[PDB]
Amino acid sequence: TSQVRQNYHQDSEAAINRQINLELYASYVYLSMSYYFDRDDVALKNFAKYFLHQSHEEREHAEKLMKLQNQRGGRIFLQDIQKPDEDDWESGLNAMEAALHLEKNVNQSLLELHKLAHDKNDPHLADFIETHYLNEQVKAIKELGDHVTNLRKMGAPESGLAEYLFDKHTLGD
Amino acid sequence: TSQVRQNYHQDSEAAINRQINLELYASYVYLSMSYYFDRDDVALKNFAKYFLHQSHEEREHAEKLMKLQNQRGGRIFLQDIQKPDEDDWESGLNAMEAALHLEKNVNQSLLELHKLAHDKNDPHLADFIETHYLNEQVKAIKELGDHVTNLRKMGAPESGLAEYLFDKHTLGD
Amino acid sequence: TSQVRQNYHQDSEAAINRQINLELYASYVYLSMSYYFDRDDVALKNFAKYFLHQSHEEREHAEKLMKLQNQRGGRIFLQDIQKPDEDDWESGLNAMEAALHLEKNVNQSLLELHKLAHDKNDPHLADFIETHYLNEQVKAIKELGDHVTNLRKMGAPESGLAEYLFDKHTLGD
Amino acid sequence: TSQVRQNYHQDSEAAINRQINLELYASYVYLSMSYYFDRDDVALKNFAKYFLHQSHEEREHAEKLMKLQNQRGGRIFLQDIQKPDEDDWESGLNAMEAALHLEKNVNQSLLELHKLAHDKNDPHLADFIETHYLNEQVKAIKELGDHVTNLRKMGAPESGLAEYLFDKHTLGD
Amino acid sequence: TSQVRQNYHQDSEAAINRQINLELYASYVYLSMSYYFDRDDVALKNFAKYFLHQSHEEREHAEKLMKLQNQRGGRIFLQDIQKPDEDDWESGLNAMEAALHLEKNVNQSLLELHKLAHDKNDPHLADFIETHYLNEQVKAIKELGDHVTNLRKMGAPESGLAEYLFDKHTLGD
Amino acid sequence: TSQVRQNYHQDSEAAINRQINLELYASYVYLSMSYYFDRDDVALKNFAKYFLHQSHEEREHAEKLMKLQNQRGGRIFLQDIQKPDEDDWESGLNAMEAALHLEKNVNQSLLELHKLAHDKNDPHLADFIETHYLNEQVKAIKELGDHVTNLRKMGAPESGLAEYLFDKHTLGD
Numbered sequence A, B, C, D, E, F: 001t002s003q004v005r006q007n008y009h010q011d012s013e014a015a016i017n018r019q020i021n022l023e024l025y026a027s028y029v030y031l032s033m034s035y036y037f038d039r040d041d042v043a044l045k046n047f048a049k050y051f052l053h054q055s056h057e058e059r060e061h062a063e064k065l066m067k068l069q070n071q072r073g074g075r076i077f078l079q080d081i082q083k084p085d086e087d088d089w090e091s092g093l094n095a096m097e098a099a100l101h102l103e104k105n106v107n108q109s110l111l112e113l114h115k116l117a118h119d120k121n122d123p124h125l126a127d128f129i130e131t132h133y134l135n136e137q138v139k140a141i142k143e144l145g146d147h148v149t150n151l152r153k154m155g156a157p158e159s160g161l162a163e164y165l166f167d168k169h170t171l172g173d
């Protein structure tokens, strides 16, 4: 047992490891989308920029959780990172909807983690999730919903004009 | 009777109180529209910016009238602020038309106030309305008419592409 | 149902709407006090400055809650804003005590909202209230209590000298 | 009863007084260690710098809690500050281990305080502890554990060379 | 015996330890007064500022004496810090008089220490007391006497107006 | 077939996908090492800094290869990222040797890729490997060998003093 461990339950430790793996997987998925939009037959540079930035943000999430694990006295256990469900994301609207679904899944995982933290009477971990993850997920979900709504009202994915003008006027700024 | 009151008729005082309430109500309506366009299923950030700024301008109108009341020797009497007629404003063109109607109503109220001020031989209040309210209402009505015309000629509200491009190229600047 | 709604209970949504209305009402009350102290027979400019700033802060509270509602997937429903209980606030000490009472009421409302949020297992809303509202209310209540104590120990409201010197040396800075 | 007290239970008030006394005692202990390393037969200036800074930080903790007490409507009751358990701290590694033990004790006290705050349904005090004390204690415990590990792997306390080089390369920066 | 000890008598060493404890106790008393004036039913922020600064100055006195002890070859022995005689200091004038009494007591202790230092033929310690403590105590006593005189001539503690205006015009600068 | 594909053989495309996966795996391994040295029972912050930077460099390698794939007309196919062989890297010298082995493996993979590129008469891909990967691998291998040699000559891993002083004087700059 580590000399710094105090009030850190092992169920919380396992949940932290699983959430690390999940954030890494989300980073992988965003990387996949980003370079999907870099293909010459898709060619939407601002979509690719957006999803690359999101991938780096998810990697930051993962590293934050690893530092948290080492901080409380837990021990990091890394698992394989699964391949994303798709290799062809069809369109920008489809990738936006997939991202919204992914963020909702990660958000439910974080919410159940917060429940487990409040149950094991771990206020430090509870507030860590409250402060560094929950509102960021809320903002990401609201933003992805805004993007999906805008792309839908413009005639996507039938109108490629819509996706071009959206790549220019919304993501290119 | 207040020691500063001079040539201030009580009909003018009641009209000032009513106009205060009306400007507050207009601010409330603009707030409603602003946060209607912030919803994830509408998602037009520049429409929301525009109507939030208009709400703050109407609140400035109200406070200006309150200071005018205290200046002439009148006495402020606040009333309830009515809820806006709608909670769902359908579209950006519809909200623009509603705003145009609201500003025309407020303008007629201010014009009848100026008539009552010239009747009671109150040149100070007459010029106060002339200087701080009339031309601002004229400019607001002309601008809302311009916006309605542009949105109409672009295919709104059927074309959501039109409202997106208008939010970007007209209100986002 | 909105595409972004997740773990947002409808009781929480109704509580958010009610708290929006309450913050708007508090803003209205502070506006009333502010322009009460602008009257020529009261004439305490720094009291008026103080209460006008407090009114703007309460309006900021309201808009923050509206953005929170749109963020979680709720739907804003605006109600009438009630007229303040009084039109003549008697004295600066009396207005300070009324403000203290109002802030205590708003604080109890926010506390019951936090209880409802922790009950419905909504940690995001719980931490939102924790972070953006609770400590601000605590600070406001402590400050209003300090002001009431100082005004009392100076001989208010009998001594108008006390209220003048307090307007100058405490609120005018 | 103070005019600002709201939802502040008296058990919480007593816990706040006890935690004030505990933070003051920790400051006293760190002061003792700091000036132990200033003796000519110990003579480790950076160890002394480190523990003096830690003493000042603990005094800041205490004053923060006193301001919190006055804020919620509680009443400060000061007790004697106990003399530290030791006057001779043997070595730098021994003082580091003593500091780690002390911080773990203070952390358990703060955790039980947070439990009592969530029990009495005091979300403001709960978030105050969450925000201003918990993560700081976690960081302090992790840092003291790092220092103890490094000193151990270097041959302390047998190797005085180890403590000298640690004072130079780790604490002197 | 320490390798640096020269002409340092053990009676002087015990006196230095006792004076360390006394300066720490004075710091504790000033802290008590400072946060007494922060209560909502007292609410004199500049009195609190003044006494907090005085507490920090007394802590500086204590640390200076500890460094002096380690310098001459003595050995620090810390004792408990006694709780201040009071928890409620009644008024600003009463706290000023208590501070004057406390500083006179500390001054007599320092004077007897200087006598013991000149007796044991310790000119270094004699000049240390002469240079770093005596005139500072004289200045503090004169300043506290000035404050007590001013508060008395203004009608304190009956006139709370007096204490308010004194907090503003004398301590708030 | 993509409209930009010219002289790009499909064996080269498969090799590019495999090398992408390998660079991602190397990034994962370096991340594992980095946060291994962040544990409280290891506690070598500069080792962790070094391996975190190396992980980010390997991720840059991977993204460079993905952009190259999209450039030539190939199609990215992502695979699972395998878990590193170890979770406990024993010591800094052991982690350095593991990193040297990993970089030698990646270098052999890149060399066989260059052979396949010169065989399929693809000078662009050959020079891409020549310019952006080969010399970087040579430098990394030489640097890791230097680090291993230095750690060995200092008495690692038996002497923890050696690893501490190496973390300070070589990696902390």
Ligand SMILES: O=C(NO)c1ccc(C(=O)NO)o1
Residues within 6 Å of the ligand: A118, D118
């Ligand atoms: O919020 C709680 N702990 O922090 C909690 C969950 C369930 C109960 C309970 O058992 N009520 O009867 O309490």
Ligand SMILES: O=C(NO)c1ccc(C(=O)NO)o1
Residues within 6 Å of the ligand: E118
């Ligand atoms: O000032 C003195 N020493 O520095 C001193 C004190 C008493 C005497 C004495 O014994 N006079 O007869 O001298």
Ligand code: NA
Residues within 6 Å of the ligand: B127, B130
């Ligand atoms: Na005119």
Ligand code: NA
Residues within 6 Å of the ligand: A127, A130, C127, C130, D127, D130
């Ligand atoms: Na919190």
Ligand code: NI
Residues within 6 Å of the ligand: A023, A026, A057, A058, A061, A106
């Ligand atoms: Ni994430």
Ligand code: NI
Residues within 6 Å of the ligand: A118, C118, D118
């Ligand atoms: Ni609970």
Ligand code: NI
Residues within 6 Å of the ligand: A169, B169
């Ligand atoms: Ni354009």
Ligand code: NI
Residues within 6 Å of the ligand: B023, B026, B057, B058, B061, B106
């Ligand atoms: Ni208007």
Ligand code: NI
Residues within 6 Å of the ligand: C023, C026, C057, C058, C061, C106
């Ligand atoms: Ni509020």
Ligand code: NI
Residues within 6 Å of the ligand: C169, E169
């Ligand atoms: Ni004055």
Ligand code: NI
Residues within 6 Å of the ligand: D023, D026, D057, D058, D061, D106
């Ligand atoms: Ni502390």
Ligand code: NI
Residues within 6 Å of the ligand: D169, F169
């Ligand atoms: Ni060195």
Ligand code: NI
Residues within 6 Å of the ligand: E023, E026, E057, E058, E061, E106
């Ligand atoms: Ni002193």
Ligand code: NI
Residues within 6 Å of the ligand: F023, F026, F057, F058, F061, F106
């Ligand atoms: Ni590489």
